[PDB]
Amino acid sequence: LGRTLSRWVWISLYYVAFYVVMSGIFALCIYVLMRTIDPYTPDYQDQLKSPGVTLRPDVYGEKGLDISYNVSDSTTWAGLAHTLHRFLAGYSPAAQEGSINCTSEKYFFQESFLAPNHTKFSCKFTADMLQNCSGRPDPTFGFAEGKPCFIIKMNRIVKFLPGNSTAPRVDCAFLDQPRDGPPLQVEYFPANGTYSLHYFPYYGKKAQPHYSNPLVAAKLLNVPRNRDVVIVCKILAEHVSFDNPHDPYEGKVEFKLKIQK
Amino acid sequence: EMEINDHQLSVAELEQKYQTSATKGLSASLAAELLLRDGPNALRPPRGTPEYVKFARQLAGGLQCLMWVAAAICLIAFAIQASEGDLTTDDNLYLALALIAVVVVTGCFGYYQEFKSTNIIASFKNLVPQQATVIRDGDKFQINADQLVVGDLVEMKGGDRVPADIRILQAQGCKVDNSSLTGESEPQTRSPECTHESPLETRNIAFFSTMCLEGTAQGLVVNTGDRTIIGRIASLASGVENEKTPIAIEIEHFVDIIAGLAILFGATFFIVAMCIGYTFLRAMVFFMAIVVAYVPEGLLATVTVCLSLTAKRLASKNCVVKNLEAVETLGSTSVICSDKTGTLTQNRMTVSHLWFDNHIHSADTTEDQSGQTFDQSSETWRALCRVLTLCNRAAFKSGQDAVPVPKRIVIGDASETALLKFSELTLGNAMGYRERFPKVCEIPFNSTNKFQLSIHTLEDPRDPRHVLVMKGAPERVLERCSSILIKGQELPLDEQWREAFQTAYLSLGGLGERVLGFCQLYLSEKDYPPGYAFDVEAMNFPTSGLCFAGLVSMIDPPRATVPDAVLKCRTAGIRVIMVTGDHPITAKAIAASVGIISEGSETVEDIAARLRVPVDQVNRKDARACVINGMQLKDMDPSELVEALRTHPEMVFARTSPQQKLVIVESCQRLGAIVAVTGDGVNDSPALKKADIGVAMGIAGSDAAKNAADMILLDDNFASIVTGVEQGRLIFDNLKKSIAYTLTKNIPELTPYLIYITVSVPLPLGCITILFIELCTDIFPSVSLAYEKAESDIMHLRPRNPKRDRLVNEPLAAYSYFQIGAIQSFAGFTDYFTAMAQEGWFPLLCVGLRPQWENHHLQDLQDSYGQEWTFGQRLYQQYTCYTVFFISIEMCQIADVLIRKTRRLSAFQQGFFRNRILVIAIVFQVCIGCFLCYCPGMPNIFNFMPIRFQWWLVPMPFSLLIFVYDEIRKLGVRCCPGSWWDQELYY
Ligand SMILES: CCCCCCCC/C=C\CCCCCCCC(=O)OC[C@H](COP(=O)(O)OCC[N+](C)(C)C)OC(=O)CCCCCCC/C=C/CCCCCCCC
């Protein structure tokens, strides 16, 4: 309404030219941007000096992981079991066909890319390796009993290496209650709680499109009924930190567990 | 009220009314009661200044209203979020705490500043109690002026301040200085008989504020305190309410721009937000976050410290401003209505002219003696100098050897004081000199003898005769001279010389000056031998056949620096009007002496007098000048005043009541002028208040005027007004440089949120960090632009046009927000993706990732290389997007502070290092910028992390595209000053 009808269009078009020019410059910058970076490795990975360990079944009440249920009442653990089942639906032999049977038992380093359309080789991790926590024989994963199976998993970081001495092994325990009760006791699968070192390192979602993190399964045999307990699973390994106070999931998982009867 | 009949009453009715005695006065008891009844004889000051309402008023204003609304909107949004369990609402809190904080802190500043102004002004006041000589129970004694009550018999002599409104009951040669009530420069006779019905123009009333120049009088207090004429004038000026200042009006108009844009950006992006599947609740919380982001948390700080720096400049030239806004007003001013007496003039009867040796000489009348003196070589001079130095009983108060001679207090009549200062300035040590010539006879000024005479013995012993010296009205002196000193001799006083005398006499009276003749006679030593017994009453010495010496003549003259100031103001396009209560002859004379009315410009009465035509037939357009007097100003319809005001551009209002000065100021404001008035007396206090800025004389000025005024000339130096103009045009031009520099960075703060809404990419920019930008890093850069010199010749420009010419307008807003802001945005996002990609998140993954990004329940999200990141880790990465968008912003602001240095000139033309303070500010900018990043622990204090030095470099191309794009802009501005390109890309 203000300026002239004949030039409203003229600098309307000027702004158009301004945005298209600038837009263009952005376009070219992001083209160069993507041409700069390696497709198989991260340039810097700065927040990943140590990996975070996640856990299944992940149920957060508030303030973090809070897993409560009542063994006599299928409906409080059915969905827990189900999130285990559909999590391991990609750890089945049928699904996990495109990977090799790792027996290296030490860091598996691939310098040359040998696999269809220039990918590289991943190890196997099939469900049955978690054994008593695989979904067979028990499809409740030890919940119905009162010794539930939690599936601990380490986050993947390209070319990261966790140690030489032994395999990186997980360790779950109470947050000490030493006078008023025994200490926690767990059976892990595969045994000793170890992710075999042939599962490291990761070479990237392009180098290994069909890759899968190693698991361990903690089966809690000790835990008392109708009492809140807090449980921590740390990863014991040299090249891993488990007490970064600004990230409570770096190397460790905590959760509150209550098993009611 | 009371006085309109008090002067008219008979003495019987007067002592009847007031229950008093015209000869003995009030009883001691009664007067004491009356004092209880009526309160002190003193003007009431403003009753309440609770120190806390000073502060509470500091917290209002266009920006501050905006900041307050924006704080509320912050908190209402915090409610709406917390109720539906949205985390990191703490950003809302910070924003409001900051906002409130900024306005409070500015507030304290603005309050303490005002404090520090009002004390310095108060440092100058004289707080010793004025006194009165009262007669009570027939006893004459001294009381404080404020213990006077209505009905007191008081007494006045030369030197006294009239202590109340007194009805004059008797007077011997009482002459009084009404320059403060009326504008009247000339002494005013007081006498007991009713001269008028209006007490303002009657002669039998002396006025509570004024000074008794000479003579003696006695009379009855007819009014006290605020019931005096002075108190009613200061009432009238209290009820005057002053308009909003120009700078405030400008700030409000651009707060209206910012409001408009924030409202509509909120609207359109809220509509948009619904059409992408957001809860009504959160499209409204975005609406809120957006209008808040258009509010610059820091601009109030930068504007006030800018203004405050100009207040420092003006203070250091003895110009003290009460509130910071006023610092600017003289820049935008386009009319100056000025007082004459004591404002333009000195209000100090000064010797101006002399007639001796058949010639009219002219003395230096300036107060610092920076003018050009007259010819002091001749014998005739030193004779005249002797008559005027010896025939005078005035005298300097003691302990004054250091205070300049025009500024010295003296005990003597008006004329005699003038002449004493004249002799002291010309001959030096007058009192000593005339002591060396023992006075042995004396006739004081006498209404039956009509002259003043005194006979003296001489200096060296070898000369034994006497010299009779005389001074009086010129015609009366001449009728007793038979002789005249000329050019080394003493000539018969023939008809040639009398015609010459009368032409010089009327020539000098025509300038409206007070001229007196001076004569002398050396008496014989035969007929008047050493020790001769001179008897006045039987006049046994001669008083005719005297030897005429010369004329000396006097006037109230302009202040030294005034005429150049008036001319500098006019060549800055400032119409300058004279509003004075004095009489029109004087009004015009001074108007010419100073430059109100130019050489060769004539009033319609001058055209008629030149062509010898009835004034009716003269073409009024042919008269540059006009002198309208105050009792035809009534008869003028407001449109007769607008016509007259814009037909003759050199206007002189004479004999104008305080109200009429308010009328003129108001009539000019209605025609859109920003008018300023300059003044001293109380008759200016109303006008001074109404004006867009009132400028009072520090020393000359009455208390009511100093109170009405926004600005005080502590040394009474009128030329500070022309520096006021200059500084005022500077900050204006410099404020829009600083404003613009702070507004642009607002768009590369809002857009990353806008995108983050619509595209749902992880948060590019957090609120903590845009607080650090706005309230910390970019502040010094923004106020440093206040140190920019002019680019054109500021002082030959016309006044800014308040309608078209504005602080920020559509060009500056558009260009700064949506072009340089855009470039800054693109620089931000470019650095965003770069940091992300380098740390692992590809741009296409970034589209719609926000839900998963912020999801505290995903502690294993996969990046483009399929790496699983905890929540904290993605969070640190987000802080890295903060720091990266922040340092992008900064670098483009290093481009922006330098580009805003100039609005038409090139930086290669004038400089990168011109402004040493701005270079300092940038060094400070990257210093704290680096401290925010690399200090140990910063991630967990504020959200900044040490960005890799790659990411510093990534924006610098966009910065320099800003430099070069704006340099070509302000290269075509000056290269091709045509139509198309300047309207659009000049601000
Ligand atoms: C009011 C006016 C508003 C105007 C806004 C206009 C902005 C539009 C500008 C640019 C959009 C992107 C242009 C894409 C085309 C260029 C080339 C390109 O395709 O590049 C490649 C990348 C992906 O490469 P790759 O993975 O296939 O390579 C393989 C990786 N290797 C090499 C390691 C194997 O393409 C991708 O990522 C595709 C995904 C790109 C991510 C979307 C960007 C969203 C950000 C928007 C903010 C824009 C700034 C707004 C500021 C306004 C200020 C007023």
Ligand SMILES: Cc1nc2c(OCc3ccccc3)cccn2c1CC#N
């Ligand atoms: C411009 C902007 N606004 C926010 C924000 O809004 C908070 C808010 C909500 C309601 C009312 C007022 C404020 C939160 C986080 C970042 N913000 C950014 C920067 C981009 N990135």
Ligand SMILES: *[C@@H]1O[C@H](CO)[C@@H](O)[C@H](O)[C@H]1NC(C)=O
């Ligand atoms: C395990 O390794 C053996 C080596 O003989 C191989 O035949 C087999 O295929 C591997 N496991 C599976 C399920 O393929």
Ligand SMILES: *[C@@H]1O[C@H](CO)[C@@H](O)[C@H](O)[C@H]1NC(C)=O
């Ligand atoms: C696991 O299952 C086997 C039988 O398959 C059983 O012998 C063993 O004790 C089980 N371990 C635990 C801890 O229940």
Ligand SMILES: *[C@@H]1O[C@H](CO)[C@@H](O)[C@H](O)[C@H]1NC(C)=O
């Ligand atoms: C557990 O569930 C059963 C069946 O619903 C109920 O009877 C029992 O009391 C529950 N125990 C507790 C501790 O809630």
Ligand SMILES: [Rb+]
């Ligand atoms: Rb802002």
Ligand SMILES: [Rb+]
């Ligand atoms: Rb002179």
Ligand SMILES: [Rb+]
């Ligand atoms: Rb005012």
